[PDB]
């Protein structure tokens, strides 16, 4: 079966993110980089401090539910994700809480720009938030998918507020805008080199081994692919010494 | 064969970090938290700022033996990896030959703290250093592995020179000192946060979802079962959610 192939291609990068230190630590290390940059961030007379968050895998941990896929052969599922999400177990990204805090009580506003779904999925989203220890998990904070899941539209919507946004912090490239949305790797790459130095700074980046907009960019067509296709194309992309 | 199950497990790691913008991302985002940091850096009266490097998986990208190990089945070997290295193959991690070229022309010295080996590893190494634009790659800059693994050593032999390490960079959380060396990922993760307000400013990290001292932390003992053993202490450590 290779719904299990490609499941279990992904086991040691879960082992990874839930159990190591390492893991940890750069969480940690994107938090205090996003504190460093926020503290020095300058803002145009009239605006306020915006800090816009990406939710899963950046600030929420959903890696339980991708722990669920592996022990069950399972591919990505939507009735599955919203299940997942009204189960109100997901669990903070390290730093993350920490973070938000003290954004909201130095002069900004973080915004959450998930594409959680707005109808099905805001009510679990909110009470884990909530229970984790967010603060100003009020309505108006969540930007949450209707339709599309293009962010930039939402990122505009919070600067005709009178934001200005400081900083993204995310841990799939298309949290920082829609540069490369739908685009293949090398294009993504790309806009990472064209941004070398927002990493860290106005970009913050927190890791994600299991899946993303990484995934769909290792192929023309990735997420349209069936499961051997996704397998094809994963392999193909390895990168490999000739052993000689 | 239980071979091909455990070098499988680590694809999705794999083509994350050898083909993802996300990955580069997070590289750009260490070695600029580090050049910052080191800008910072506060070194006491008589002393030369140093900063402490690892090479593998920080300075040096060994990716395409992974990529040889996924295609051909194989566990890691150390004949395998010696000639790996002798290849002279090697690239550089993003960001990594601008911070260490920046270090070095800015009142301070890298010093490479590795676990490639003096005697048969120190000549292909230094021949990619030189090739992908590493400066001060002399003899002395260099402490490679001779017997042990465990790094403090190595790092107080730096100490007794009259330098102060103001900054250590790696992918494992032993590249910052010994207090985790050999330990379960438990005490690791409890290291991390004995030292959050550490990372992105005195330790910087690297991500590696592919191997390390994290794989070993996964049960007691780990290195010494064999692929079984490790594929089942893998699945062991998946935490998952009850589908409910
Ligand atoms: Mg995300
Ligand atoms: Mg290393």
Do not use: C
Request: aromatic share 12%; glycine share 10%; hydrophobic share 35%.
């Amino acid at each position: 079966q290779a719904n299990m192939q490609l499941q279990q291609q992904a086991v040691l990068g879960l082992n990874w993110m839930q159990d190591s230190g390492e893991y940890k630590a750069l969480a940690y290390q994107a938090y205090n980089a996003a504190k460093v940059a926020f503290d020095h961030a300058k803002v145009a007379k009239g605006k306020k401090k915006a800090v816009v968050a990406d939710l899963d895998e950046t600030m929420l941990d959903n890696s339980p539910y991708a722990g669920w896929q592996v022990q069950n052969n399972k591919p990505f599922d939507g009735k599955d994700w919203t299940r997942w999400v009204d189960a109100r177990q997901s669990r903070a990204v390290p730093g993350a809480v920490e973070f938000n805090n003290y954004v909201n009580s130095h002069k900004g506003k973080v915004f959450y720009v998930t594409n959680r779904k707005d109808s099905s999925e805001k009510a679990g989203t909110i009470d884990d938030m909530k229970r984790l220890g967010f603060n100003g998990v009020e309505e108006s904070a969540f930007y949450l998918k209707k339709d599309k899941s293009a962010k930039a539209a939402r990122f505009a919507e919070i600067e005709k507020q009178g934001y200005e946004i400081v900083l993204y912090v995310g841990d799939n490239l298309d949290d920082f805008g829609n540069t490369v949305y739908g685009k293949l790797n090398a294009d993504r790459r790309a806009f990472v080199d064209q941004n070398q130095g927002k990493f860290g700074k106005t970009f913050i980046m927190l890791p994600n081994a299991n899946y993303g907009g990484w995934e769909g960019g290792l192929a023309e067509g990735y997420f349209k692919k069936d499961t051997q296709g996704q397998i094809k194309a994963r392999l193909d992309a390895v990168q490999a010494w000739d052993g000689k």
